[PDB]
Design a protein around this ligand. Sequence first.
Ligand SMILES: CC(C)[C@H](N)C(=O)O
Ligand SMILES: [Ca+2]
Ligand SMILES: [Ca+2]
Length: 348
Amino acid sequence: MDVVIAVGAPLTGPNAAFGAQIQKGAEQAAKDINAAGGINGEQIKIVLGDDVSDPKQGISVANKFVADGVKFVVGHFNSGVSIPASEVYAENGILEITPAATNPVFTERGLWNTFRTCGRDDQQGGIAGKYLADHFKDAKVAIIHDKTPYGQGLADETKKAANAAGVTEVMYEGVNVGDKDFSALISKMKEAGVSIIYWGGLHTEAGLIIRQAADQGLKAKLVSGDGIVSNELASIAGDAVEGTLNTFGPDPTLRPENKELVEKFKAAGFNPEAYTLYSYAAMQAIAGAAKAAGSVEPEKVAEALKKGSFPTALGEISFDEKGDPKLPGYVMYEWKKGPDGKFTYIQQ
Ligand SMILES: CC(C)[C@H](N)C(=O)O
Ligand SMILES: [Ca+2]
Ligand SMILES: [Ca+2]
């Protein structure tokens, strides 16, 4: 029959825009592959499952996929959703390739079925920790995190790397996802002389910290990672977003080879920023591996991914024995005004 492929993502909630990056990128790839003859002569059927960035909801989504005969899942977005959902998939013969979950644990559990098109946070924290050392040598650094597996994980990888290169944070604090008032923490950071705020977490909380920090007169730069790369940050944060820093892969939309693809998304009215092409590529990889493997059986395609190499919107993609991709590493971005005059992220 058709090859049933699920999108497991935050289609609603604070991270809906990310959920839409993943959905649109996955739907466009299925559309393109199908018009090309599908996977090994078979058409791809997309199903959608909304995890609302909640682990328990993600587990329910995963069990549903299992039931609907899903064979491949592109997703999820959050590490804390992906890690538990992957067990459910591992047990019920379903290959999961995440375009966005970066926590090392995802691929460090020996599971047959876990792959990514994105990097991992030992890599990302490496880069950031070093950068803090290469540019804020004597700054009073606060490390703040959202108490999630992703957010605390990245903040810990960043702290580890920084601590090691010589930089010793003056504060290390967790906040709760959904919290809206950071005055106390901000008042704490001001007493501490904080001039750099390193945030392991997502854009919602990040934008509020930026906004309120400026309003309380804390002159500190926020440095974060992949979780803040959505154009909503500028709205949440306001003009205070200027000068914010964050790590992320090289922007795939800037790849000359993607020019026509990017233009197609844009003609459809969607700006395929950030994780959109990472998701497109997840789909490319499944198709490329299945062809190399002469099979659409998930266990076999998984073996194919680990062995083969495949053309994608992200470049030539290969995978190591754990399912991690071999691709260009994390680079630093700064938030500045674009041509249109609004703040966005540009590689330094
Ligand atoms: C959600 C995403 C931005 C993050 N990399 C995570 O693993 O949760
Ligand atoms: Ca998480
Ligand atoms: Ca390999």
